[PDB]
Amino acid sequence: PLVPMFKDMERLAQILRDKRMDRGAVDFDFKEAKVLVDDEGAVKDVVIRERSVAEKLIEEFMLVANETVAEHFHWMNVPFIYRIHEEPNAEKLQKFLEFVTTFGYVVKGTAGNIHPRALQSILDAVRDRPEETVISTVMLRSMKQAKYDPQSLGHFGLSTEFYTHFTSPIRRYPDLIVHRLIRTYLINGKVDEAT
RNA sequence: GUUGGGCACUCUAAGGUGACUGCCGGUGACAAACCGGAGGAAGGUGGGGAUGACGUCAAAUCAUCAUGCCCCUUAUGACCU
């Protein structure tokens, strides 16, 4: 009974992913380790963490929910919490652009006005190359860390203007705050100056 | 800097230019906003500074005001070492 829904979920996730990549999001697909332990905490193995179709599908659904909530509250113009990723440091990024030129990769843009899509075009060009891992690593080191902020400053890595965390309030206090602000402003209608 | 000297550059004292997110767009209600993008000595409150109608609250404080209610009065007074 669920198989038809799962096939529609896969198609929708692909449509959302295609849109996200066309918007110029940076797909940072790095090989992470997963340490496997037993019930006694003894190490059994160290494997590559793979992101499957099912994880990527849920990722796209949580992303579009997160974007939709952030955009809604941005236009409501009430105090809210955002998940921001600021523009890269122009000096670090200039050094990265000089670095990838040594491998013969030429990027369209200047370090002070780079579009995320221009970085994604490098990742796509280095995919399945020996130099992939290192170009990827030096690109990451040129980016800023994402953080929580009351200002909607956008999310460079996701190439979006509106982003918040809404989808995990059991394990993230920002999401729990987002839920309280939703209840305060939308459900209870409490948009008064003192609130 | 002496020794002149209008003393340019000082300097000092005004006066006056001066900056306005104004220009100018990316987004978007061709909106806002924000990203800006230039000019410029300097930027978005050019930056720090700056503002009453009914003033008003056992605010705060009986050393605010109270003497409160004190009191000692050749002494709950001053002078000396």
Point out which residues pair with A32 in neighbouring strands: A49
Q: Give the residue from A177, A186, A158, A143 showing the smallest Cα distance to A62.
A: A158
* Single-letter code of the amino acid located at A81: I
Count of alpha carbons within 13 angstroms of residue A97, beta-carbon side: 18
Q: What three-state secondary structure class fits A49?
A: strand
Residue pair A162/A85 in contact by the 8 Å Cβ criterion: no
List Cα–Cα distances, A185 to A71, A80, A188, in angstroms. 14, 10, 6
Q: Helices A53-76 & A173-182, crossing angle to 10 degrees? A: 50
> What is the spatial distance, in angstroms and rounded to an integer, between the CA atom of A10 and the C1' atom of B14?
78
Nucleotide nearest to A110 in CA–C1' terms: B37
Strand B-proximal protein residues, Cβ less than 7 Å? A 75, 87, 112-113, 153, 161
- What is the CB neighbour count within 10 angstroms for residue A83? 23
Which technique was used to obtain these atomic coordinates? cryo-EM
Nucleotide nearest to A151 in CA–C1' terms: B34
Torsion sign, CA atoms A72, A76, A80, A84:
positive
Resolution of the model in angstroms? 4.7
| Cα(A123)–Cα(A133) distance, integer angstroms | 10
* Single-letter code of the amino acid located at A65: A
> What is the spatial distance, in angstroms and rounded to an integer, between the CA atom of A94 and the C1' atom of B8?
47
| Cα(A65)–Cα(A164) distance, integer angstroms | 9
Q: Is A174 left (phi over 0), alpha (psi -120 to 50) or beta?
A: alpha
Nucleotide nearest to A153 in CA–C1' terms: B34
